[PDB]
Design a protein around this nucleic acid. Sequence first.
DNA 1: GGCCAGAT
DNA 2: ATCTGGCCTG
Lengths: 152, 175, 157, 193, 41
Amino acid sequence: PESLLKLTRALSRLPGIGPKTAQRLALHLAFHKEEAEALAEALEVRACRECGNLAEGELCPICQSLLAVVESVADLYALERSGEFRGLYHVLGGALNPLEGIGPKELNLEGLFRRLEGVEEVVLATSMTVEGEATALYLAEELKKRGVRVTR
Amino acid sequence: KLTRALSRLPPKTAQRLALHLAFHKEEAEALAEALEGIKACRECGNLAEGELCPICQRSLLAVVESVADLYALERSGEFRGLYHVLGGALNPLEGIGPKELNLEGLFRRLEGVEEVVLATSMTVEGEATALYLAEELKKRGVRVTRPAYGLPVGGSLEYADEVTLGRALEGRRPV
Amino acid sequence: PESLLKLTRALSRLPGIGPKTAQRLALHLAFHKEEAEALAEALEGACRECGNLAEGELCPICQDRDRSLLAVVESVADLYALERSGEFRGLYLEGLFRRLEGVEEVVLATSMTVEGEATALYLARVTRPAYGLPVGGSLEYADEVTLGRALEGRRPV
Amino acid sequence: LEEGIVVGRKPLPQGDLLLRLVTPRGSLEAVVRKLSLFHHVRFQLYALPTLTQAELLGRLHGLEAPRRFLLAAFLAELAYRLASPEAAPRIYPLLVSGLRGIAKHEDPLLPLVWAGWRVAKAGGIGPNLELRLKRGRLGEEGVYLGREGVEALKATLRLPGAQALPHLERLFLALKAHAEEALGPLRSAEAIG
Amino acid sequence: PESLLKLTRALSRGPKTAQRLALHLAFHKEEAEALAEALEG
DNA sequence: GGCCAGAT
DNA sequence: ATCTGGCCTG
Ligand SMILES: [Zn+2]
Ligand SMILES: [Zn+2]
Ligand SMILES: [Zn+2]
């Protein structure tokens, strides 16, 4: 029906989905009616007070020396599944893309500026992508001129 | 609660999508709206706006285990009969028997002259259900037909099971 | 190193392995003579009337079997599979017409490949296995053409 | 690699299947990604353990009868509930023999009860036969087994099956009562009416 | 067959290619002999 | 099924 | 700025 049409539209709109997959999942949820309200209730943690990251509670586990910088939560999850580092970290709200028009003014970097205090070492956990590498190098140069140690 | 709901969907993509939904409230509200909007036909069992489907608003009838199977059959296009949707299959291990199925609802729609396709599962349990329903129908004076056992299209002999091949042999047809 | 050339050519000739895969296998076997010798010492460890390959002139099918039933098979892999099956007591195309003598029913054990379809059309008692749905699994994991043929091939019981 | 029987099929909502098997070394539970019921199968488990390979060793074609299928399911469930690892080497050949008997014999109930009584005896749940048996004990309460029934039960419990068959050529009710007393209710008990 | 399994196992030192090659060698005595000669070589 | 290299 | 064909994961 029209409700099925709008459900398929909603599923297709969200990233990482296929229209055939969207339709098959719509039919599957038409088959399972309890899973509908189960997902609805499971649909309904905020920014950390200090770091600003998503926190299961009041502080993110990072807060609860080292300082890594990333752009997506997937990097944080890869780090935690690796689980070799314990120091502080960060997540950035974008990547400086000349063709997109992202600029350093749109970054969240003054938090990093005040966070610079009491930092023994920093790791540039940037994405292998060339633009991300360039952005990380440019930030590391902007931070070296202050007189802070930067490590790869 | 989120991780389990995302895992119920048929890992990394589930998590990335959950995170995006957390960071995109509007999409989540739109999805809840579509779900409420979405919130079986009395006779056929397919989808319908309200009570009866547009088709309902018949000499052939197809017995089917679930609604998904009904819809698959309709997508096949080779069936324009009516359907009776059971609640499942017989299962002593799950306490499922004559006191759990919709037999009496079935008997309110059946007549003397009719053919009931036996589209049960291809298991020991589905075969037992098929034979039981066939016996119940022959007692109650109605034809019993069973889809053809045999090899599937695009199937190789090397990887076919011995039972499928034996049924193919036993059920071989002239040409 | 001229000796390895023949080995590389021999492994190259078999289907499914490219020249670089053969060279890689030869190099891996060059410094691993332990399992090369193990493979060498482990290596040791068709009749006209049938067409079956077997040690000796007469196959085990010829060597408790009947000549009434003869089934034509596309490949010997299917012959081995049906030997592992064991549902016919009988013995096991272009030459079918001049083998029709002494045969009272013809069994068609060929696969349903398009080549088999064309061969059957060209050759047009003779019997052929039916088209139907397999055993076990889930009805949602099937294909539309099989559904249609099973619906139209529906048998009376 | 292990060899055993298929006695449990629980479909999984994600399209998988929960398998329940018993070997001469003990019962087990296994799962498969995406082997028919009551088939003696040799399988390789990887670890619930996930099955990797399966080999068919035989089919019981005659089990498709409704009553025969119900009796076979009863026997398999009772075997699984009695499938202790110590008793498994005893029950497994008894399981196979009972399945073969119920497949081949004209009356499945005869070899069914014959195998079930021996499985109950070997599983540590041997009833105390020292005319009505109650909670595995003879007396004036319970199902009236009768003198002939008591004699046949004693012969089966003491003599081997070869000469125990003629004696048994109602005990099912007593065996069911004893099994329910020992282990509790049975899921499959609803089917028979 | 024992020699077939021995060959598939030596080739495994995927199983589908191992099998295809073992079958091919069984059905090509000359090629298999040449391969045993080159391996001895 | 979905993303990227290279020519117009 | 558009568009065809090859590639990896599934
Ligand atoms: Zn924090
Ligand atoms: Zn309708
Ligand atoms: Zn021969």
